[PDB]
Write a protein that binds this ligand. Structure first.
Ligand SMILES: OC[C@H]1O[C@H](S[C@H]2[C@H](O)[C@@H](O)[C@@H](O[C@H]3[C@H](O)[C@@H](O)[C@@H](S[C@H]4[C@H](O)[C@@H](O)[C@@H](O[C@H]5[C@H](O)[C@@H](O)[C@@H](S[C@H]6[C@H](O)[C@@H](O)[C@@H](O)O[C@@H]6CO)O[C@@H]5CO)O[C@@H]4CO)O[C@@H]3CO)O[C@@H]2CO)[C@H](O)[C@@H](O)[C@@H]1O
Ligand SMILES: [Ca+2]
Ligand SMILES: [Ca+2]
Length: 684
């Protein structure tokens, strides 16, 4: 199928996601509504259930609300069964309407629908070309108190009805009993409770297996993507292992939520996006956009700076999910924020790199500050707002123009209030001009672009006061950009030479099937390169002009570049593809008596690519932890490592550029065939 079809579960670059709180959208079936105190028919007390369900989503898909809006994917609340109990937090009654208080990841939330309703949602969605993305929260169950089992449901977990265990009397150690996190460090936030939510101990073999089994269930039902909640509060190692099991079974686009407060680069965040096997919600992009269009605390330069900085930090910037707001912050729209600014932020987001997501109601200019006010009921289904118009005209461009879906970004003109950028991919180009100044127009002179000679019409049709331009070999004739204007000019044409636009997933073991999207691959089965290794014939399960499904060859584990050769012509190289040694398992490495010097950290490396292949650089594992599970001078770290393999490893201390290794022989350990394990050694 073409890279743009609904069947492409590995790439969302050509899509526009619509994030919706299932309970706050449409109550299509009042028969499944909760009873009593947990329900509010008027939906005025936003902490209670309002009745929204999967039937309501089905209805709006059938009457073409989403089709006319232009969205091609739906991101819904966690579908799993949540606790039924009601919780009173200092006077106010709270319910699990948000879906984050799971109790059984193998059953559906009765209030949203049955297992059958869910299947019906998938079918109905796919029939109209809409992908379904689900929220999944494997970090915890629900609120719990160890001393009081009568609080909520004591964070109890069920395996399709069968009780696995609760927070109190957790003899098996399914959860962490290290208190609540104070967010003082990364380690503190991973092994301690997120508020009062019972934290899972993924090192426990049962919990590890439970989540691999539980996710397969939903993948088997046809979900096209996964939004992993609180990725910053679970070990990267376990998550990478979990991700490889997903990719070996049914690869789907997966991204996580790692909260960031500014557009500033964050080392840990960058590492996660580059090493976990999944991408992230682009909080840096979000901050810049809000600072510039909403809050007026930054100018266009901050926007351009962020575009360049993020493109440099993330290996695959096109996999990051962008947005102007969501359930974790104030609604973009405020009384002090103009409609045009909201509209410009949307246009910018929809034409920029990454995978754009729209929080439900944005098209209706919904207001609401903080939790829960920002999760109000959908006020209307009108298709007449300007914002609705902008989305319907720009969203389709991600499918029709590869420059917008896979292209690079270059600044063509800029000043405090004006920004003109260019998206380019092969011969296809897209140019967007934005003037955030609401009162004064701007005279643009000396603008150059890659647009071929010709006359260009504003894709928006002037709804955002856009204008038409004339290109003379890229040189655009002088023009006036109206106050608060924003225009989109583009040019698309067929590509003759092979060009890779996206590869998904970007991690896997030999035998897994990866998807290569792009242009000009031709219909004749060619050859795929993973470094220097050529992959041909049967190994290439599918080959079309815009997409190539290929099997990962049995080469040495490591970092590889991917190229495609069609009719003797070599395409561009898609860098940083990770090939694993084989199936993964999470192992906790513990080392005793590793006393260090001020500012000196402990790292780990060994004889497999997953351990860095004896490297002491960015591929080495670390820095190790030393506060929560084990205390200094004992260090520890959870690492995704190959299953059933004899490993050789050593720890090393690194302060500045001085590296001091362990003496003696290398430590050895044979990893288990599956699950988890703990290996403890003494510093030599
Ligand atoms: O005693 C403390 C506290 O007790 C309760 S809080 C109570 C709340 O009243 C309920 O509404 C309910 O809240 C749940 C919420 O409704 C659900 O949607 C989820 S939220 C989920 C987030 O989506 C996810 O992002 C993450 O949380 C992240 C935050 O979103 C993000 O902003 C930051 S928090 C960061 C702040 O920005 C800073 O301002 C500063 O405070 O430092 C903070 C450091 O993190 O990062 C977070 C983690 O990445 O995870 C949450 C958890 O699911 O669940 C909510 C919790 O269930 O339930 C809570 C308690 O369970 C009292 O009501 C309150 O007054 C009191 O302060
Ligand atoms: Ca209902
Ligand atoms: Ca945790």
């Amino acid at each position: 199928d073409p890279d743009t079809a609904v069947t492409n579960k590995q790439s969302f670059s050509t899509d526009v996601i619509y994030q919706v709180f299932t309970d706050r959208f449409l109550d299509g079936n009042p028969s499944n509504n909760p009873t009593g105190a947990a329900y509010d028919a008027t939906c005025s007390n936003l902490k209670l259930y309002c009745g929204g369900d999967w039937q309501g989503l089905i209805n709006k898909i059938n009457d073409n609300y989403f089709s006319d809006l232009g969205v091609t994917a739906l991101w819904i609340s966690q579908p799993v069964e949540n606790i039924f109990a009601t919780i009173n937090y200092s006077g106010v009654t709270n319910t699990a309407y948000h879906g984050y208080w799971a109790r059984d990841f193998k059953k559906t939330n009765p209030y949203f629908g049955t297992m059958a309703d869910f299947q019906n949602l998938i079918t109905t969605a796919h029939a109209k070309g809409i992908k379904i993305v689900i929220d999944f929260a494997p970090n915890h169950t629900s609120p719990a108190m160890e001393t009081d089992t009568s609080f909520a449901e004591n964070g109890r977990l069920y395996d399709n009805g069968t009780l696995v265990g609760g927070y109190t009397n957790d003899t098996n150690g399914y959860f962490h009993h290290n208190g609540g996190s104070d967010f003082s460090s990364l380690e503190n936030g991973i092994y301690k409770n997120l508020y009062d939510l019972a934290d899972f101990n993924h090192n426990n073999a049962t919990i590890d297996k439970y989540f691999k089994d539980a996710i397969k269930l939903w993948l088997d039902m046809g979900v096209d993507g996964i939004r992993v909640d609180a990725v910053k509060h679970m070990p990267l190692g376990w998550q990478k292992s979990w991700m490889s099991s997903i990719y070996a079974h049914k690869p789907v686009f997966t991204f996580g939520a790692w909260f960031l407060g500014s557009a500033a680069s964050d080392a840990d965040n960058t590492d996660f996006a580059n090493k976990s096997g999944m991408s992230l919600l682009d909080f840096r992009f979000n901050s810049a956009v809000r600072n510039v269009f909403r809050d007026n605390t930054s100018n266009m330069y901050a926007l351009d700076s962020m575009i360049n900085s993020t493109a440099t930090d993330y290996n695959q910037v096109n996999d990051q999910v962008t947005f102007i707001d969501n359930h974790d912050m104030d609604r973009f729209k405020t009384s002090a924020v103009n409609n045009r600014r909201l509209e410009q932020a949307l246009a910018f987001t929809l034409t920029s790199r990454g995978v754009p997501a729209i929080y439900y109601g944005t098209e209706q200019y919904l207001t609401g500050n903080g939790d829960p006010d920002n999760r109000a009921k959908m006020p209307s289904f009108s298709k007449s707002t300007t914002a609705f118009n902008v989305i319907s005209k720009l969203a389709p461009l991600r499918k029709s123009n590869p420059a917008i879906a896979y292209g690079s970004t270059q600044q063509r003109w800029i000043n405090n209030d004006v920004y003109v950028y260019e998206r380019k991919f092969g011969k296809s180009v897209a140019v967007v001009a934005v003037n955030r100044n609401l009162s004064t127009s701007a005279s643009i002179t000396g603008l150059s672009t890659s647009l071929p000679t010709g006359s260009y019409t504003d894709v928006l049709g002037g709804v955002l006061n856009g204008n038409n331009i004339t290109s003379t070999n890229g040189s655009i004739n002088n023009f006036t950009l109206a106050a608060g204007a924003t225009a989109v000019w583009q040019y698309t044409t067929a590509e003759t030479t092979p060009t890779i636009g996206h590869v998904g997933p970007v991690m896997g073991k030999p035998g897994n099937v990866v998807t290569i999207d792009g242009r000009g691959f031709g219909s004749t089965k060619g050859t795929v390169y993973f470094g220097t290794t050529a992959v041909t014939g049967a190994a290439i399960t599918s080959w079309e002009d815009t997409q190539i499904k290929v099997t990962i060859p049995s080469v040495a584990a490591g970092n590889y570049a991917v190229k495609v050769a069609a009719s003797g012509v070599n395409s561009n190289a898609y860098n940083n593809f990770t090939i694993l040694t084989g199936d993964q398992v999470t192992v906790r490495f513990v080392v005793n008596n590793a006393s260090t010097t001020l500012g000196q950290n402990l790292y780990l490396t060994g004889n497999v690519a997953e351990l860095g292949n004896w490297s002491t650089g960015s591929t080495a594992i670390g820095p190790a932890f030393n506060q929560v599970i084990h205390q200094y001078p004992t260090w520890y770290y959870d690492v995704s490592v190959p299953a059933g393999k004899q490993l050789e490893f050593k720890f090393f201390k690194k302060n500045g550029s001085t590296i001091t290794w362990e003496s003696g022989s290398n430590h050895t350990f044979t990893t288990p065939a599956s699950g988890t394990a703990t290996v403890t050694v003494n510093w030599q």
